[PDB]
Amino acid sequence: SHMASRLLLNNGAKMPILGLGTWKSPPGQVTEAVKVAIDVGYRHIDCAHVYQNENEVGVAIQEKLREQVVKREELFIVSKLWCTYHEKGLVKGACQKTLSDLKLDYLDLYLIHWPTGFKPGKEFFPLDESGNVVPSDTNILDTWAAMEELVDEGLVKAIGISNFNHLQVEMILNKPGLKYKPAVNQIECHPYLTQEKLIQYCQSKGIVVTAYSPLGSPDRPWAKPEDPSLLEDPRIKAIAAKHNKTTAQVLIRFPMQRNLVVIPKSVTPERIAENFKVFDFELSSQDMTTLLSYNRNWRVCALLSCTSHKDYPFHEEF
């Protein structure tokens, strides 16, 4: 299908372009899900402390390492620094908790999960007496410096960002004394949110983009009937049919052909395997342009609770 399995990051390491997502994967199902994924070829798992299932993901990884199904060097494990840990003095510990839960001695990639810092505490979303998120007075540049320290301590091989708009990416690239550039910006991306501007900006700077919610996150907690549905879009099912593939496989192959990394989530063994079988076919330039034409700037993850946060990323056009 003219498609290599990994691409090169600006830290000199290779990253598998297909990973398994784990947001919403129940703790009692995600261990099996990750084991099946590794068994059927996945080498990249996308994690986060905020998903509350890193321990169980770690059990799967550790078992597959112990069983010698895979070597640590062959895995690319990603996690993310949650918003309540943006303070310089909290970053190492947040990373170490993730490392401990995942049962790893390093991460291949650690991302700032959102540009928005929240007040530290037990609550992932600390709210005031009226429901707004309570910000922390941290800024993305000092948070970035804390991330750079993790590289210099051997805890992570690469650092990156997630849900940064192009001006926020630019702020980091123009940071005084910048030591390591972001390797990756992980953003939402699918035919209803195509992200041409932000993707072009990032790629022009050598920053690799990871596409999240590539299937439209049909299991998002806040879904409503009136929402558009990628998996049920007859226009996309048509393209799938033409290629004798599933709609999901087309949705996964789509970002791959844009030089994106993509991380579909499933806890269903049959879908986990199906979703990986996307290196055997090619979307035409016409297919690609047609899928792109479905853009409607529609967001699964809009972080509506934080629209007043100074660093809220989605006021800007891109």
Ligand X SMILES: NC(=O)c1ccc[n+]([C@@H]2O[C@H](COP(=O)([O-])OP(=O)(O)OC[C@H]3O[C@@H](n4cnc5c(N)ncnc54)[C@H](OP(=O)(O)O)[C@@H]3O)[C@@H](O)[C@H]2O)c1
Active-site amino acid positions: 51
Stretch that binds ligand SLO, among 43-51, 90-98, 249-257, 262-270 (CB under 6 A): 43-51
Nearer to ligand SLO, 23 or 110 (CB): 23
Which of the choices ligand SLO, ligand X, none does residue 59 contact, using the CB cut-off of 5 to 8 A by kind? none
Considering the complex, what minimum distance in angstroms separates the CB of residue 129 from ligand X? Answer: 27
Chain-centre distance for alpha carbon 276: 17
Site string for ligand SLO, 112-131 (x = CB under 6 A): -------------x------
Task: Provide the strand spans (E) within 86-239.
Answer: 109-112, 159-162, 184-188, 208-212
**CA–CA separation, 22 and 38 (whole Å):** 13
**CA–CA separation, 96 and 20 (whole Å):** 22
Q: Which residue is nearest to ligand X (CB)?
A: 21
Stretch that binds ligand SLO, among 3-11, 45-53, 57-65, 93-101 (CB under 6 A): 45-53
**CA–CA separation, 291 and 279 (whole Å):** 18
**82 near ligand SLO, rule: CB under 6 A:** no
239 among annotated binding-site residues = yes
240 among annotated binding-site residues = yes
**50 near ligand SLO, rule: CB under 6 A:** yes
HEC profile for 251-275?
HHHHHHCCCCEECCECCCHHHHHHH
**CA–CA separation, 65 and 79 (whole Å):** 18
Among the listed residues 134, 148, 158, 231, the one whose alpha carbon sits nearest the alpha carbon of residue 192: 231
Contacts to ligand SLO from residues 5-24, by CB under 6 A: 23
- With a CB cutoff of 8 Å and minimum separation 6, the contacts of 74 are 43
Nearer to ligand SLO, 141 or 301 (CB): 301
Which of the choices ligand X, ligand SLO, none does residue 138 contact, using the CB cut-off of 5 to 8 A by kind? none
**Residue 180 has what DSSP assignment?**
S
Among 51, 110, 254, 312, binds ligand SLO (CB under 6 A): 51
Contact residues toward ligand X (CB under 6 A) are: 21-24, 46, 113, 162-163, 186, 212-219, 231, 246, 248, 263-268, 271, 274-275, 301
